[PDB]
Amino acid sequence: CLVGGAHAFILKISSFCGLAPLRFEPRSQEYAVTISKGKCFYSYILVTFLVICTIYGLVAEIGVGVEKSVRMSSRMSQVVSACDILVVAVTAGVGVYGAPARMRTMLSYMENIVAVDRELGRHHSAATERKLCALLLLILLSFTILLVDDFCFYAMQAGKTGRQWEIVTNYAGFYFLWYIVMVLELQFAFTALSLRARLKLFNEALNVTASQVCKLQVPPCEAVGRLSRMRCTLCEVTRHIADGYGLPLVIILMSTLLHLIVTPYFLIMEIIVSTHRLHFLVLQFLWCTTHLIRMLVVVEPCHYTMREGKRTEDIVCRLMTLAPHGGVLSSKLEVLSRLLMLQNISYSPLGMCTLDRPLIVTVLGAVTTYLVILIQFQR
Amino acid sequence: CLVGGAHAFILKISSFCGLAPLRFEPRSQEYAVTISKGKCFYSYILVTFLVICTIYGLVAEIGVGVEKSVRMSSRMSQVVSACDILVVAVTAGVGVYGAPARMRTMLSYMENIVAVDRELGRHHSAATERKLCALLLLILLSFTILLVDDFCFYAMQAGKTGRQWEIVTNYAGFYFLWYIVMVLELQFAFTALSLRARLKLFNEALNVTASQVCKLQVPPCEAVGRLSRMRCTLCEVTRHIADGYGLPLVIILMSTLLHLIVTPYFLIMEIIVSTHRLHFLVLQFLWCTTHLIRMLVVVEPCHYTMREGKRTEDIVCRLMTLAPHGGVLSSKLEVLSRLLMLQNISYSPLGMCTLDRPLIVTVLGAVTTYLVILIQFQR
Amino acid sequence: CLVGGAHAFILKISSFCGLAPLRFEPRSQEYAVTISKGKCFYSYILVTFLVICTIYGLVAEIGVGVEKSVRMSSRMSQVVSACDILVVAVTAGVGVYGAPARMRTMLSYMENIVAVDRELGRHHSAATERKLCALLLLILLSFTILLVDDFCFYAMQAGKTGRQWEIVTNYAGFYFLWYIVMVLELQFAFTALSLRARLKLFNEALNVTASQVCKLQVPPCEAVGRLSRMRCTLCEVTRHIADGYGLPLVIILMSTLLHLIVTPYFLIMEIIVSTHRLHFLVLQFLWCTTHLIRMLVVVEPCHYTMREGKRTEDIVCRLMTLAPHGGVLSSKLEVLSRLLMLQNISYSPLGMCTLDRPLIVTVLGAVTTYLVILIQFQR
Amino acid sequence: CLVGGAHAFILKISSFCGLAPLRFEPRSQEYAVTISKGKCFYSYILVTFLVICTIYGLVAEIGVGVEKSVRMSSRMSQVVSACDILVVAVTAGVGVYGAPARMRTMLSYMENIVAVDRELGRHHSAATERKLCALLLLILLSFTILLVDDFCFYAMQAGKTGRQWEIVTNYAGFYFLWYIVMVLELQFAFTALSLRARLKLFNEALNVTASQVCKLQVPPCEAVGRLSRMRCTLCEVTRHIADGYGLPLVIILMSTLLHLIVTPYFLIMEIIVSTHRLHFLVLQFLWCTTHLIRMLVVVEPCHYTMREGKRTEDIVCRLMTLAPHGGVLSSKLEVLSRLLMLQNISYSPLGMCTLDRPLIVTVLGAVTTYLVILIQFQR
């Protein structure tokens, strides 16, 4: 297949991250894309090594006494730190170990999306992807800064206790697994949002049909037809993406619920003791901010897609009300008016949950319960 | 745009409340309405000042010892009082700081609503708004009385402890923020309910089409068409209002859940100690009544709108069953019978929750859990 | 209006119960029915008196010491007994004080139901009501027996402690309020289930249209039309009943959730002490059975109505698949196939909850939480 | 009726398990099937005997002191062991005591399924059932191994304490009831999944209609009709199966929620004491795995059926978009496009819950609450 503009860049990031084993060749505005068996094998080696190192680190930190373990001063702290580490190793594992199938899925649907773009204004439509890439890359940079600053803070806790080398080798795996699960989450928030921008362009191309019939190189008598076919393809591609991501997309939500449990637990315990550990207190608040912003980066592209859905259901009904009775346009709008009832576009990871924003009301409805219930066992 | 009747009065209230930066000019039954940049800047100054004063008050009350702090006798009381104050400052802030965009939204949809009223019986239709205004203003008067009586009670607690000036300056901000969030909530319960009354008038204008065809200046062959167009416009306007309010409409619900947690906590603790503080006990019960009545003033206009929805789905199906087969009326009723399946009228703030009355079953399903869980940490 | 068969008997029960202020005159198989202002005033007097007596009883039992109060041995026992009494006084009050409007609703919809029965097999269709009455009356008899046996047990606790007269006058009101709320709940479970039996008869009258067209005094070309009109009327009547009952129908569910909290609390505390109070232990288990069976008598007629709904959606689609293309029957089946998408028949009290059986999964999902949370405060 | 291929084998298992009282006669690839009154009476005797023996065992283990009761060392352990046993006796009872009606249901729907298969590729379609049987039998073998290993472990606990005969006779009933409820659950996961495979074959037979019209012994003008009739029959059969299983299908889910409460309770208590009981610790973890895998064997065939549903709604809309306007194929696709809106295929046991995979999010949302709440009462 062919990738045009910044989608090539976000995939290049996922490739060096081992989340997209793609080999590609340059073009004047594009890259031709292929799977490499070697890059798959490299990615499996890399993440298997980093998962082994992360588990070996967790085992070492469980073995070292609570006296020396600068964030694991008690059994309960060991339990919550194990929760912090382990589900991120789960998300990293189940994410990358599916990566070849996810890229088979992308190499399937992207040909259809290119065929759709060939009618829906592909000309300069890449500027939308350029803007979305420029916006989204800044999130990964911000997280990289925060992760490094976290490791530097714990490295200072190690240095002030004389244990730098061991606390380094115990966590350098875990931090890189965090970075990998961030790259997976951003890659989802890119693909599902470029598809949303294409839906927006389709929707405006339909909207101007309303003015064309009230008063675009073919009459609405044909244009509504060909747009309804594109409105089929731009559903099938959404169900492709929702399936190819559905497993890590739900695992990362479960891991983020667990982190929104574990991080406030630390914040509260570390302000029940004397607040003198100011750097820790701030770093944990910035982590709580990241553990919310990541969830908002998961759910926002879905809500902004389903709003394009609802606005298409609006503008079709406007057009259907203006269109003259019984003429061919009326029948083709009938076709579209049923299509919008059958092919409802919506992400749902493994079908396990409706990924619209009510998911945040549900997840916070769990977080606020479980945080308090868990704290109650500390005292 | 133009505002006729008491909608001008409720907007005038919101204007002096700094929730609607509208400049308007009088007419024999109406006002012409415009945004003023000066009234925007004034509103931003006013609410920024009152939020600064409210935070400065909360900081002062946290600084003053629990001995002298007549409702903050312990750390837990300080925590729950901070919850009481702060989310009301959040609602006031996020409410007013969006006000110019909300009035841009109103100045958009109200022209379409005036165009709809030009066909749906705008003649004397203002009496519905007059009645709704007369009913709703009494709620704001009642709340103003309750708020003043609360401040007078705490001022008496201050006077009997010799601390009147400090307890005054610590809370005069907070009370005015409460008043502002009440004005925002009432303004929603006006706009979303005037739109409901217009839906009712549309629905009756359709209902009498059933008698007209069984036996309104044009045949049903045209009237059902033009009504179906109005039935599009009276959906688009609902999605405009639901979006322009959606953010403060959900923040105020979250704040009201938090108050239905905090206020019963006070009531229970202040009846676990000796009930001699009769004025406090009554005032807190009246606050619990207000914290329920406000939520009912949020949800009731939605439920009474969706009941007009359901009754329109009923009466259309009556009309469709009587209408003769294959004649033009049958096709136009087909159009309407699909429109009612696509353009389902319903509020949903930011889409985050279905604002129908099942929301109260959900929110009380949370309140009764969290109140008990929180009390359990006191003892 | 006119009431035929056992519906007259169940209304006669509700009339002597003061839940249906109907004056009626006999016919050879029917009664003519009217509202009496005198029977309304009598019912308001009766329930106002019994609510005053029940509150006066609760006040007396709160005044008498826990030593003598044979089921109120502690403050917590007083709190849960107050919960037991008070929401039943709420249900009795809000039930009966709406009774005239509920009978206005019945005197409205029953004329339409008689008009429907005039086509859908009203001839001997009363035998369904006869069977349903015979079944449902046995539930009220069983509850009357259980209530009397409860009062006799507590009267024996009073006699063995020498306090019979006071414990009698403290509870004789409460028991009669329980009986009134049982009569209200049964009356709902009669009306909503006779309407279900009429839906079943309609559905079979449609089903045999499938054989008539595959091979009922008019061709399917007309019969499906007239049945679709009846299928409108048998929705409008359901929305009438669901609204006229919706308030006490939801209050009684909330009261039954509260009783499924309070009664197991007694059962557990009274088996944490020595089980020697065998009669009490059995009587409380029989009460827990009644507090489940009442909820099942509320929800079952709804689930058995919506199953007739779903089976009508099935059999219409069978008929639509056999019917020949383009002939008039195809258009009339199109009409019906949309009607089944718009006029979905379902009860919902005040819209506050979907009264289908998932309600029991939701309510038990609350009961099992709140029972344990409440017990945790006892020790 | 007639059963072809491995469905005969899974029914033969259920017959020796007393869950399917079928008498059958062999054919070259099939068996003719009948109910036997004798096999019904035998099954009622067998399960009544084993329920009596299981209750007698539970009573004996409650009678024997906590000193000797190798998994019932305290009252709380007796309570949770009673929960472990009793709801499995409930599931076994309510399962088998309905078995004749369930086989009446099967002997009804299987004739229609054979009639459908006569058009949808029944030729070699049995290989799908062969594969599904080969896969599913391995689950019952695995569970049999685990159950035997559990009984052998407890028999060793008995032998090392000299009490082998009594601990044998106290549990040999319970284990066989576990095996019976496993056979019931697998039988559901066979029937509901063979029906899914038939839906898949139907769906592909429709899909190739898209290529046939773009370019199967009759034109799409007929084929889409006859397929839409089969698409009715393959809904009616699903509602038959969902009803005939709905009661034990929901009871077994409730029992599995209760086991996911009770088993982690043991695991946690038996790791709060010293872990030396390694065999117990492993066996309880393998039980927790089984208590998850059983629930996944319940829900997975539903989710994989509703995905065939959604993919049929997709491919119909593809076909409807290609089909030429106004020709007969367009009307027959209109028929199908409404049928997919009315006859939505989905299991729901007793309607009490949507059995799609969101059920696992709901049930784990309960499990994680109730496990912690219950543990909190231990200490």
CSV table of N, CA and C in Angstrom, one decimal, chain D residues 68 70 152-164 167 276-277 279:
chain,number,residue,atom,x,y,z
D,68,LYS,N,-11.8,-31.1,62.5
D,68,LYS,CA,-11.6,-32.2,61.5
D,68,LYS,C,-11.9,-31.8,60.1
D,70,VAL,N,-11.5,-30.4,56.9
D,70,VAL,CA,-10.2,-29.9,56.4
D,70,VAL,C,-10.2,-28.7,55.5
D,152,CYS,N,-9.0,-36.1,44.6
D,152,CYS,CA,-7.8,-36.8,45.1
D,152,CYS,C,-7.0,-36.0,46.1
D,153,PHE,N,-6.9,-34.7,45.9
D,153,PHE,CA,-6.2,-33.8,46.9
D,153,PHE,C,-7.0,-33.8,48.2
D,154,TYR,N,-8.3,-33.6,48.2
D,154,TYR,CA,-9.1,-33.6,49.4
D,154,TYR,C,-9.1,-35.0,50.1
D,155,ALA,N,-9.1,-36.1,49.3
D,155,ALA,CA,-8.9,-37.4,49.8
D,155,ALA,C,-7.6,-37.7,50.4
D,156,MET,N,-6.5,-37.0,50.0
D,156,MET,CA,-5.2,-37.1,50.7
D,156,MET,C,-5.2,-36.3,52.0
D,157,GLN,N,-5.9,-35.1,52.0
D,157,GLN,CA,-6.1,-34.4,53.2
D,157,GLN,C,-6.9,-35.3,54.2
D,158,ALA,N,-7.9,-36.0,53.8
D,158,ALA,CA,-8.6,-37.0,54.6
D,158,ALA,C,-7.7,-38.1,55.1
D,159,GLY,N,-6.9,-38.7,54.2
D,159,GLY,CA,-6.1,-39.8,54.6
D,159,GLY,C,-5.0,-39.4,55.6
D,160,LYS,N,-4.4,-38.2,55.4
D,160,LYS,CA,-3.4,-37.8,56.4
D,160,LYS,C,-4.1,-37.4,57.7
D,161,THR,N,-5.4,-37.3,57.8
D,161,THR,CA,-6.1,-37.1,59.0
D,161,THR,C,-7.0,-38.2,59.4
D,162,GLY,N,-6.9,-39.4,58.7
D,162,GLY,CA,-7.6,-40.6,59.1
D,162,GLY,C,-9.1,-40.6,58.9
D,163,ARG,N,-9.6,-39.8,58.0
D,163,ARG,CA,-11.1,-39.6,57.9
D,163,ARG,C,-11.6,-39.8,56.5
D,164,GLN,N,-10.9,-40.7,55.8
D,164,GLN,CA,-11.1,-40.8,54.3
D,164,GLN,C,-12.6,-41.2,54.0
D,167,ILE,N,-15.1,-38.1,54.6
D,167,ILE,CA,-14.9,-37.0,53.7
D,167,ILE,C,-15.2,-37.4,52.2
D,276,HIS,N,2.5,-23.0,52.8
D,276,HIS,CA,3.0,-24.4,52.7
D,276,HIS,C,2.0,-25.3,52.1
D,277,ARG,N,0.7,-25.0,52.0
D,277,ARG,CA,-0.3,-25.9,51.4
D,277,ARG,C,-0.3,-25.7,49.9
D,279,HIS,N,-0.2,-27.6,47.2
D,279,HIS,CA,-1.2,-28.3,46.4
D,279,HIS,C,-2.5,-27.6,46.5
